[PDB]
Amino acid sequence: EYRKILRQRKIDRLIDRLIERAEDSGNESEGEISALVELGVELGHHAPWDVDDL
């Protein structure tokens, strides 16, 4: 923010956290973890990932 953006790319860490959770749970819990991601797809990735930009 103060140092011209870049402070954004911090979120990229989520990918690392996402994979650990599977390892950190015991039974992984894909239905809870993987299926969570699917929710993003149904609304058309509120983010610019729908390819068509929703």
Side-chain angles (χ1 to χ4, degrees):
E1 183 178 0
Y2 295 92
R3 291 179 180 180
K4 182 180 179 180
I5 311 172
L6 306 177
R7 306 308 311 172
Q8 186 64 56
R9 193 171 297 176
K10 182 178 181 296
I11 36 48
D12 188 350
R13 291 179 180 180
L14 292 174
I15 191 169
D16 185 351
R17 185 177 181 277
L18 179 59
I19 54 170
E20 290 290 344
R21 177 63 169 278
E23 289 172 346
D24 288 347
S25 167
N27 65 9
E28 287 171 345
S29 90
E30 288 172 346
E32 291 174 349
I33 291 163
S34 179
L36 181 61
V37 172
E38 290 173 348
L39 180 60
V41 169
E42 292 290 344
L43 276 293
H45 293 287
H46 192 279
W49 292 115
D50 193 355
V51 193
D52 290 346
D53 291 345
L54 209 174

